[PDB]
Design a binder for this molecule. Structure first.
Ligand SMILES: O=[N+]([O-])c1ccc(O)c(OS(=O)(=O)O)c1
Ligand SMILES: O=[N+]([O-])c1ccc(O)c(OS(=O)(=O)O)c1
Lengths: 282, 282
């Protein structure tokens, strides 16, 4: 069977080799180094591939999986909020998906600023947050939506749709079903916003680096990778892209931890199976 | 005014761009293609989004607008009736809303079989039609109700409540007041039937692809989309979902013609205004 134990063990074997190869050495030239000064990485061992880095002072990467273009990042550190908002505004972000829970954000020990549910001033940037719809995803998991309006003197004002999975559970994986519902919602939100930009003749439409959904959880490697994998499977342009391809691509373009847990890879396996998409490359 | 000429012009503009982007190319990969064979699309330019298609041999789509889950389809071709009945039964359809007029049905040149007002045999499926209540909706518009009992050897017998509005003319919008009364009746009918299935511990309750109201008119883009929009505004879970959201969601999940006529979009605007719901996204 293409989705049996033997196939799963082979997929695991190829991915483990790749994680090992991509493990960051001290002062690794493959990875962004703090430039710095200020702490760049939220976690010491969770680093940001230099050649696909979005900004020199964020832990954030452009990732293309097949045809699917995204940005994946860590939850921005306190010091990084201005730069983070500048990334969001410059990208003409069509959806920001935050997969860290309300309980994580509320936990002062974790240093995850509640930057999208309240208004605020961050250096030369001001941000206004407004609550919009709430969408159930299944299993009682809820997406709370917002718009963030980012203002800065001498810059165009940009509003960004936010999808926040406020009760992502901390003790269990989220199911493939909830994952698929979340990828659909995030993709739909992006498509509505991207359409507005296309309608106005935005020059961002022509720029490979712009109009990318931005996805973060806490480290930007576990929950983030599970959603990015599900989004690439939702994309009609990605026929025949294997699970091995998707995960290898996320790993090379961000770090070797992308899809951090077995349960996360299992979701991607189950979604692929549902589509009759291959796990392994021939 | 957020409901004035300027707002409405901007809404139309965004919706037009989307329709144009969604236009099906010859052999478009975003859309379901005829599997042979028999005609799939009742109208060659009214196509069925592949990623949300219900069955490979029907022009029919799962649509979720905010939290509201439905199925929208074209009036089934004769050769599609058997598959159409199998969709209805497998979905444990809580209500089937038919918005095609008695005149259209009667017009033999339109090829719209009278599949719900009479009993019949469709391959291995037998269907028994029984008339139930009649509910007036305003402006002399009438909802005629039925119960379709679908039987097939070795399969569970399923009964489907039908709401047929036989006097909503093709290419028109009934008033916002009639639309609101029809959405209430359709939602109420589904609620009663869904309750029955829950009382019996039906497995369909847990399944997101099942228990969806099914709505069709002739093409499944005009009158259908007006009703679906009204149903989503009747759903208490959809606070702050904009008209721009609702229509963009219907378009991405079926085709770019959803909400075919200005007058239909006008009913949705008028219903939104009545609720202080936004027309546009920020
Ligand atoms: O490795 N980590 O540093 C790490 C820490 C906490 C997380 O919750 C996590 O998972 S993640 O946020 O889904 O990527 C990853
Ligand atoms: O868009 N169309 O090409 C189309 C064709 C026939 C219809 O009868 C129609 O109207 S509809 O049945 O209310 O969707 C729409």
């Amino acid at each position: 069977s293409p989705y049996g134990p033997e196939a799963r063990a082979e997929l695991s074997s190829r991915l483990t080799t790749l994680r090992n190869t991509l493990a960051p050495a001290t002062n690794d030239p493959r990875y962004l180094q703090a430039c710095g000064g200020e702490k760049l990485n939220r976690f010491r061992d969770i680093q940001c591939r230099r050649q696909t880095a979005v900004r020199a002072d964020l832990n954030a990467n452009y990732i293309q999986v097949g045809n699917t273009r995204t940005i994946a990042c860590q939850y921005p550190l306190q010091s990084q909020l201005e730069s983070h908002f500048r990334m969001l505004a410059e990208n003409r972000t069509p959806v920001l998906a935050v997969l860290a829970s309300s309980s994580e954000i509320a936990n002062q020990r974790f240093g995850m600023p509640d930057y999208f549910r309240q208004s605020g001033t961050y250096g030369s940037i001001t941000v206004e947050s407004k609550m919009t719809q709430q969408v159930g995803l299944g299993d009682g998991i809820m997406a709370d939506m917002y718009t963030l309006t980012i203002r800065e003197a001498g810059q165009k004002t940009i509003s960004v749709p936010v999808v926040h999975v406020g009760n992502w559970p901390d003790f269990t994986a989220v199911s493939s079903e909830v994952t698929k519902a979340l990828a659909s919602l995030v993709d739909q939100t992006a498509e509505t916003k991207r359409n507005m930009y296309e309608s106005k003749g935005s020059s961002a439409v022509a720029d490979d680096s712009k109009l990318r959904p931005v996805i973060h959880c806490r480290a930007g490697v576990g929950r983030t990778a599970q959603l990015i994998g599900a989004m690439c499977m939702n994309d009609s342009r990605n026929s025949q892209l294997s699970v091995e391809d998707m995960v290898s691509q996320m790993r090379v373009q961000r770090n070797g931890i992308m899809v951090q847990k077995d349960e996360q890879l299992d979701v991607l396996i189950k979604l692929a199976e549902g589509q009759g998409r291959p796990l392994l490359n021939s």
